[PDB]
RNA sequence: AAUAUUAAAAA
């Protein structure tokens, strides 16, 4: 039961250059009628939704209970009809496989009430009415395609995008219905996800093992193959195709794996899989040296199995697979716009008989919305120049500029973990020469040559070397670590540097040492300066929100879930009034838990550090929360607002700073496109950085907005969505939109406006770093692993 | 790991 009401929208923004946009939201007209909600209970109880749908489809065809109605169904418990069914609780006995089915009336759901919420803004949006509409509009798609979350996919036709390792890309679309002012909106986007190829198990095995001289699998090969195929469904081909789920792969080859077979004589014998296939099916195995799949002592030789079609790949993709998939699926904004428009035409929503049954109509053109391009802030640099930077198309640079507070680097070391042959002494010297030149220009002078420069190999060499360095070189400020590509050395450098010894480290791939770029070296300096306590730039102070007239702390929070492994929570807090410098807190928690369990304590730590750093108690807390699943906003808000308040009260009983709580979401399918082709930016043709929308496609009365704060480089930009779930601070829409945009210009790792505010982005980096610190059991040990060293606690080690 | 953006997230 929600008790913290989200703020109503205080108004719409008026600041910024108007820009005409199109959104992939299509207006939906609904009849102002009652719809009838029935519960369906199917026994057996835990069949796949696709099986449940088959059952209800059978019943609807065979029991016209239903009359001439066309019910819609969610594949679970919920059926809806446009007029009442001629019943009171009805029990059915279906043979399609025998099912016991019961149906009973549950509710009347009002679309008149839904309409009233959308037009008047005087009542809550009735979620039960929205659900009925969502179910009706996706019913037919759910019968035709393969549903995956809120998307639909179908087998590749006319295209083929293998990812290697027995996986391929399927294209489809996302569909959702959302309330807006005046009308419901149908959100449609194209999508793509990885599925396992429908192919023989032997072929899947060869892809997974990178097999192009028949011999048994090595122990390594078998464990590898097992991890990939365990949990997948296979179908057999020797019986003319029964499906099974794979629970293991046998240690023994088919030639030697036995099971107990009872003979006619009553005696039970240990029969091998190969012998059994020969006698029972007259099947001589071609690969008896390969193991068997254990399914359901049921063992299947690999060669009688195929991977069942339509299985989405849930496991993480390799870097190559991920790169391949991004390539195959990237689309410019105008191309995506056309694909969506084309999809809508081919879909003919208005000709769907369920949509017709429920009197629904869908507009076939994208919704027009006038957005505004917010002004970008000016950044203030330091040095003798005291230069300013004026972002242009979301970007600026360091030319002629020096850091606001640049650190002088007097004592530094180099540790090269790439082989000396691939990174010679003269090459290291050219690298350091160029870096010192760039660092000087940036106002972060590296005074001399390194105190120490050594070659090493293997993760095991890191701690001995770093301990030596810490002990031998007083006042050591930095170790630059050269790495030979992707390596376990990185995780160990960060474990030892961040958690064990508390020493600043900056890693660099050998490829960027061998061939240097001024841009790459300049970017390295942005990180080094901040890691060593400096400030790269600040927002020009007089052009900020009035919240800066009193002490204010900005917090960013994120939660990361495992692909056993814990979930990781991270909260960062600003430590100055700029805001530029941040400190981080991080914890491990129960896997898949979405609420930040330890939020109160983490906030308390950050408030305490803010006081130490500034000598002020914050009178306002501005909290940007990333990682929140759609649908769970009320629950996360309830517990976390209380946890932030708890932190305050525990510091001092009457401490009640004004809290603004904002959810940041990039994982949605709202896309915005320039309506005037003339205003598109770059090759990708995206909306300009700063494009903001708070009308037409946003909530009918709550306080949410889209802001695409970044320049789109590739594909179609995702505009970040911001939901203001609490605001004690009385922000105007312009004020809070502008503040959010300015914070996207304070992110230290690049001279660009990034897609989410720096505090949220930092929390993401802190959580990701904890995953490296955890690279290697009991909960106590895991918690210790992510605790950074005392000398690291107060630093931006996550930059 | 210079960096942002970008797809997904019976036997």
Swiss-Prot record:
<dbReference type="Pfam" id="PF02171">
    <property type="entry name" value="Piwi"/>
</dbReference>
<keyword id="KW-0887">Epilepsy</keyword>
<keyword id="KW-0225">Disease variant</keyword>
<dbReference type="GO" id="GO:0001046">
    <property type="term" value="F:core promoter sequence-specific DNA binding"/>
</dbReference>
<dbReference type="GO" id="GO:0035196">
    <property type="term" value="P:miRNA processing"/>
</dbReference>
<dbReference type="GO" id="GO:0005634">
    <property type="term" value="C:nucleus"/>
</dbReference>
<dbReference type="Pfam" id="PF02170">
    <property type="entry name" value="PAZ"/>
</dbReference>
<dbReference type="Pfam" id="PF08699">
    <property type="entry name" value="ArgoL1"/>
</dbReference>
<feature type="region of interest" description="Interaction with guide RNA">
    <location>
        <begin position="667"/>
        <end position="671"/>
    </location>
</feature>
<protein>
    <recommendedName>
        <fullName>Protein argonaute-1</fullName>
    </recommendedName>
</protein>
<keyword id="KW-0687">Ribonucleoprotein</keyword>
<dbReference type="InterPro" id="IPR032472">
    <property type="entry name" value="ArgoL2"/>
</dbReference>
<dbReference type="GO" id="GO:0070578">
    <property type="term" value="C:RISC-loading complex"/>
</dbReference>
<keyword id="KW-0804">Transcription</keyword>
<feature type="region of interest" description="Interaction with guide RNA">
    <location>
        <begin position="710"/>
        <end position="718"/>
    </location>
</feature>
<dbReference type="InterPro" id="IPR032474">
    <property type="entry name" value="Argonaute_N"/>
</dbReference>
<dbReference type="GO" id="GO:0031054">
    <property type="term" value="P:pre-miRNA processing"/>
</dbReference>
<feature type="region of interest" description="Interaction with guide RNA">
    <location>
        <begin position="485"/>
        <end position="527"/>
    </location>
</feature>
<comment type="function">
    <text>Required for RNA-mediated gene silencing (RNAi). Binds to short RNAs such as microRNAs (miRNAs) or short interfering RNAs (siRNAs), and represses the translation of mRNAs which are complementary to them. Lacks endonuclease activity and does not appear to cleave target mRNAs. Also required for transcriptional gene silencing (TGS) of promoter regions which are complementary to bound short antigene RNAs (agRNAs).</text>
</comment>
<dbReference type="Pfam" id="PF16487">
    <property type="entry name" value="ArgoMid"/>
</dbReference>
<dbReference type="Pfam" id="PF16486">
    <property type="entry name" value="ArgoN"/>
</dbReference>
<dbReference type="GO" id="GO:1901224">
    <property type="term" value="P:positive regulation of non-canonical NF-kappaB signal transduction"/>
</dbReference>
<dbReference type="InterPro" id="IPR032473">
    <property type="entry name" value="Argonaute_Mid_dom"/>
</dbReference>
<keyword id="KW-0991">Intellectual disability</keyword>
<dbReference type="GO" id="GO:0010586">
    <property type="term" value="P:miRNA metabolic process"/>
</dbReference>
<dbReference type="GO" id="GO:0035198">
    <property type="term" value="F:miRNA binding"/>
</dbReference>
<keyword id="KW-0943">RNA-mediated gene silencing</keyword>
<dbReference type="GO" id="GO:0035278">
    <property type="term" value="P:miRNA-mediated gene silencing by inhibition of translation"/>
</dbReference>
<dbReference type="GO" id="GO:0010628">
    <property type="term" value="P:positive regulation of gene expression"/>
</dbReference>
<dbReference type="InterPro" id="IPR012337">
    <property type="entry name" value="RNaseH-like_sf"/>
</dbReference>
<dbReference type="InterPro" id="IPR036085">
    <property type="entry name" value="PAZ_dom_sf"/>
</dbReference>
<dbReference type="GO" id="GO:0003723">
    <property type="term" value="F:RNA binding"/>
</dbReference>
<dbReference type="GO" id="GO:0045944">
    <property type="term" value="P:positive regulation of transcription by RNA polymerase II"/>
</dbReference>
<dbReference type="GO" id="GO:0016442">
    <property type="term" value="C:RISC complex"/>
</dbReference>
<feature type="domain" description="PAZ">
    <location>
        <begin position="200"/>
        <end position="309"/>
    </location>
</feature>
<dbReference type="GO" id="GO:0000993">
    <property type="term" value="F:RNA polymerase II complex binding"/>
</dbReference>
<dbReference type="GO" id="GO:0003725">
    <property type="term" value="F:double-stranded RNA binding"/>
</dbReference>
<feature type="domain" description="Piwi">
    <location>
        <begin position="478"/>
        <end position="775"/>
    </location>
</feature>
<dbReference type="GO" id="GO:0005654">
    <property type="term" value="C:nucleoplasm"/>
</dbReference>
<comment type="subunit">
    <text>Interacts with DDB1, DDX5, DDX6, DHX30, DHX36, DDX47, DICER1, AGO2, ELAVL1, HNRNPF, IGF2BP1, ILF3, IMP8, MATR3, MOV10, PABPC1, PRMT5, RBM4, SART3, TNRC6B, UPF1 and YBX1. Associates with polysomes and messenger ribonucleoproteins (mNRPs). Interacts with LIMD1, WTIP and AJUBA. Interacts with APOBEC3F, APOBEC3G and APOBEC3H.</text>
</comment>
<dbReference type="GO" id="GO:0070922">
    <property type="term" value="P:RISC complex assembly"/>
</dbReference>
<feature type="region of interest" description="Interaction with guide RNA">
    <location>
        <begin position="747"/>
        <end position="772"/>
    </location>
</feature>
